[model samples]
Target: MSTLSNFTQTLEDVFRRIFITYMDNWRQNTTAEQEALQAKVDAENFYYVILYLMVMIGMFSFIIVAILVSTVKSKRREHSNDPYHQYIVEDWQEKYKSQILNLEESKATIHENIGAAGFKMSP
Candidate 1:
């Protein structure tokens, strides 16, 4: 497999394990509360339930962001390459100057042609 895929797969697997661990913790805590609720009416139970819900939300949010970031970073790396190593070694302006000049020339031509009218509007 390519290194980018390999790295991203590993990252996903790691986060999956983290998610499962947190989920398991939630299950364990919530199950006992279900049993407790049947036995007695405790005021603190409400806080425990709310706190557990917030923790679950945080866990899922972290997992989603982690996966998304890893996928996007891998995609960017996959699409990036420097055909000319020397260009970067010297200066970016050296490679970018020609492209900039062409853009400016095109912009100037467009500006000169459009005389404050839409495509030379004439009746």
Candidate 2:
């Protein structure tokens, strides 16, 4: 009948509505099917459950390996037509190769045998 009573009633109604809504949501979320499924999962031996999880993880690992292999192959395929990729193995034989030999075995850079005759040069 007064302002204070009306305000108190309004606040009580709001709190009751909030409480009922939360209770309804909690009941729905914890229904019989959810509880049954939880029971089934919990009843299993944890190791085998995680063992299958490890299998799943291993499958993903193989998927990663497969992706890596395919990517490397695809890169090889792409680079094959390009200059750097081709003749890679063969290039190892000659390109930047170190030719080790005795000085006598190797020929001089200048015109014929001049250093052997001793022209004792200065730059």
Best candidate, TM-score-wise? 1
Candidate 2 wrongly placed segments (more than 4 Å): 1-44, 78-123
Best by lDDT: 1
Q: Show where candidate 1 strays beyond 4 Å.
A: 1-43, 78-123
Per-candidate clash tally? 0, 0
* Model 1: per-residue Cα lDDT over 1-123, one tens digit each: 589987998989988998999888899889888897778766687887898899999999999999999987878866566676765756877777889899989988898767676575569
Model 1, CA-based lDDT: 0.84
What's model 2's overall lDDT? 0.77
Question: Candidate 2 vs. truth: CA RMSD?
Answer: 37.7
lDDT of each: 0.84, 0.77
| Clashes by residue pair, model 1 | none
Clashes of 2: 0
What does candidate 1 score in Cα RMSD to the true structure? Answer: 22.6
Tens-place lDDT per residue, model 2, 5-116, is: 8799898998899889888888887787788886767545878779899899899999999989998898775534546677778886775455543344466555466766
Cα lDDT for residue 90, candidate 2: 86
